[PDB]
Design an enzyme around this catalytic site. Structure first.
Site, PDB file in Angstrom:
ATOM      1  N   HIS A 187      19.110  99.548   6.329  1.00 15.87           N
ATOM      2  CA  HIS A 187      18.152 100.648   6.164  1.00 15.87           C
ATOM      3  C   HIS A 187      17.810 101.330   7.485  1.00 15.87           C
ATOM      4  O   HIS A 187      16.835 102.101   7.563  1.00 15.87           O
ATOM      5  CB  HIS A 187      16.902 100.185   5.381  1.00 15.87           C
ATOM      6  CG  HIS A 187      17.302  99.440   4.167  1.00 15.87           C
ATOM      7  ND1 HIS A 187      17.921 100.073   3.092  1.00 15.87           N
ATOM      8  CD2 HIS A 187      17.250  98.114   3.886  1.00 15.87           C
ATOM      9  CE1 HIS A 187      18.256  99.178   2.188  1.00 15.87           C
ATOM     10  NE2 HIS A 187      17.803  97.926   2.634  1.00 15.87           N
TER      11      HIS A 187
ATOM     12  N   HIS B 258      34.679 119.592   1.417  1.00 16.03           N
ATOM     13  CA  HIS B 258      35.879 119.040   0.777  1.00 16.03           C
ATOM     14  C   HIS B 258      35.548 117.944  -0.253  1.00 16.03           C
ATOM     15  O   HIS B 258      36.435 117.545  -1.017  1.00 16.03           O
ATOM     16  CB  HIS B 258      36.943 118.592   1.795  1.00 16.03           C
ATOM     17  CG  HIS B 258      36.620 117.330   2.520  1.00 16.03           C
ATOM     18  ND1 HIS B 258      36.055 117.322   3.806  1.00 16.03           N
ATOM     19  CD2 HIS B 258      36.842 116.028   2.199  1.00 16.03           C
ATOM     20  CE1 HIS B 258      35.960 116.075   4.248  1.00 16.03           C
ATOM     21  NE2 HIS B 258      36.413 115.242   3.267  1.00 16.03           N
TER      22      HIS B 258
ATOM     23  N   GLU C 128      19.773  96.147  -4.658  1.00 22.69           N
ATOM     24  CA  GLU C 128      19.163  96.883  -3.554  1.00 22.69           C
ATOM     25  C   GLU C 128      17.774  97.384  -3.960  1.00 22.69           C
ATOM     26  O   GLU C 128      17.590  98.537  -4.390  1.00 22.69           O
ATOM     27  CB  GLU C 128      20.069  98.050  -3.141  1.00 22.69           C
ATOM     28  CG  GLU C 128      21.391  97.580  -2.522  1.00 22.69           C
ATOM     29  CD  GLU C 128      21.257  96.896  -1.162  1.00 22.69           C
ATOM     30  OE1 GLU C 128      22.265  96.299  -0.697  1.00 22.69           O
ATOM     31  OE2 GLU C 128      20.123  96.935  -0.565  1.00 22.69           O
TER      32      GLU C 128
ATOM     33  N   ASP D 205      33.166 123.169   7.095  1.00 24.07           N
ATOM     34  CA  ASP D 205      33.297 122.101   6.097  1.00 24.07           C
ATOM     35  C   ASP D 205      31.922 121.486   5.796  1.00 24.07           C
ATOM     36  O   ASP D 205      31.590 120.374   6.252  1.00 24.07           O
ATOM     37  CB  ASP D 205      34.320 121.058   6.564  1.00 24.07           C
ATOM     38  CG  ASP D 205      34.684 120.037   5.499  1.00 24.07           C
ATOM     39  OD1 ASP D 205      34.262 120.211   4.326  1.00 24.07           O
ATOM     40  OD2 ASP D 205      35.407 119.080   5.835  1.00 24.07           O
TER      41      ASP D 205
ATOM     42  N   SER E 133      34.198 110.456   5.050  1.00 25.39           N
ATOM     43  CA  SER E 133      33.953 111.895   4.860  1.00 25.39           C
ATOM     44  C   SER E 133      32.529 112.188   4.401  1.00 25.39           C
ATOM     45  O   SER E 133      32.057 111.551   3.444  1.00 25.39           O
ATOM     46  CB  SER E 133      34.897 112.486   3.787  1.00 25.39           C
ATOM     47  OG  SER E 133      36.115 112.853   4.401  1.00 25.39           O
TER      48      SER E 133
END
Ligand SMILES: [Cl-]
Lengths: 223, 166
Positions: A10, A41, A61, A86, A177
């Protein structure tokens, strides 16, 4: 993330997981209680987004939320030129209550400083080609625009910057990404693209240069 | 488009990490192979060979830091392992085939192909100069072989089978 370690749990509470059929395919970054910034993308017609995670199993969690989102807006100049601009903004169906484990981060207004050490985090591939069970963190350092353009022209565009390429082989990798690159306390970049394989000495990765987009982000969130 | 490219089990095709067979939907009895073209001594052209099934597996690669492939992404396509660039596809003018698919040992960061939904499967589309106009890859029959080559409007349609038999 190549040659990193488990994040302190965290410690990166802006980290968002974009999941498809219960598997992560990209990350994003909470930048407002109802908006997640990610790489264009990673665009899909709808999303399931995990916030407050460490492992990717929300049922293990406490404090996590799995939230739906329908609407997203790619930057209007995404992919012109190819790979450039992007970024996209995903509007959550509802605003989240922020907590110590789910928190937005401010975006850098100043552009990257060559040489500066920054942090990237994500659930993408490790050096061994396997996926980690918990969020990984690593430091990478910003490379000068001169070096970025030398290595990546004709595809270098100032909507990008380069970081990494050290002897240390620290890098982002596939599945990272859309995740954050933090410099000096602020969100500076998004993981975007690079030369395969990950973690090659002398080869930095390429990140979306968010200092170029603060006005578009602000306008999109307000509209 | 924004559609994720999937394999015959409906699972996303990976970005480089796994290999796959391009199985023609109406030629499952045939498979990709290398053959000679022109006067070349080594086989460098890609054919659909009726004697090999499922044929040589490929990997699809994008520089994006993602581990799935979308139909909109520009791709490299290559034979062989991730670590090797000796099997990378390109499209090369070669009489009398036309614009023939061939292998080369160099690779651009961003390749010139896309994988696009067509009929019951996918077609391979070649974009000269990575511009806006794509040319379908189909079959050209010459010298007793079926070469993969540009045949716009007459694509070879494939399904994509993960190469877990190896
Ligand atoms: Cl099958």
């Amino acid at each position: 993330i190549i040659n990193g370690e488990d994040c302190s749990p965290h410690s990166q509470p802006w980290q968002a997981a974009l999941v498809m059929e219960n598997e992560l395919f990209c990350s994003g970054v909470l930048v407002h209680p109802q908006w997640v910034l990610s790489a264009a993308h990673c665009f899909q017609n709808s999303y399931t987004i995990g916030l407050g995670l460490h492992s990717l199993e929300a049922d293990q969690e406490p404090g996590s939320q799995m939230v739906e989102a329908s609407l997203s807006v790619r930057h209007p100049e995404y992919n012109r030129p190819l790979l450039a601009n992007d970024l996209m903004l995903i509007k959550l169906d509802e605003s989240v209550s922020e907590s110590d484990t789910i928190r937005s981060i401010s975006i850098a207004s100043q552009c990257p400083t060559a040489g500066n050490s920054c942090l990237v985090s994500g659930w993408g591939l490790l050096a061994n080609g396997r996926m980690p069970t918990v969020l990984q963190c690593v430091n990478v350092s910003v490379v000068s625009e001169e070096v970025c353009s030398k290595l990546y022209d004709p595809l270098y565009h100032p909507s990008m910057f380069c970081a990494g390429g050290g002897q240390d082989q620290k890098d982002s990798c596939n599945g990272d990404s859309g995740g954050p690159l933090i410099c000096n306390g602020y969100l500076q970049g998004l993981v975007s693209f690079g030369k395969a394989p990950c973690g090659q000495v002398g080869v930095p990765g390429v990140y979306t240069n968010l200092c170029k987009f603060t006005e578009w982000i602000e306008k999109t969130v307000q509209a | 488009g924004s559609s994720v490219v999937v394999d015959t089990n409906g699972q996303p095709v990976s970005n480089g990490a796994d290999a796959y067979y391009l199985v023609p939907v109406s030629h499952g009895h045939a498979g990709l192979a290398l053959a000679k073209i022109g006067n070349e001594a080594e086989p460098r052209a890609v054919v659909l060979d009726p004697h090999h099934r499922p044929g040589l597996p490929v990997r699809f690669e994008s520089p994006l830091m993602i581990n799935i492939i979308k139909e909109s992404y520009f791709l490299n396509i290559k034979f062989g392992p991730s670590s090797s660039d000796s099997g990378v596809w390109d499209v090369i003018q070669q009489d009398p085939i036309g614009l023939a698919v061939k292998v080369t040992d160099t690779k651009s960061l961003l390749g010139p192909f896309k994988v696009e939904k067509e009929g019951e499967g996918y077609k391979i589309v070649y974009y000269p100069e990575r511009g806006q106009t794509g040319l379908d890859i189909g079959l050209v029959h010459r010298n007793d072989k079926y070469y993969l080559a540009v045949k716009d409007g007459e694509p070879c349609v494939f399904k994509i089978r993960k190469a877990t038999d190896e």
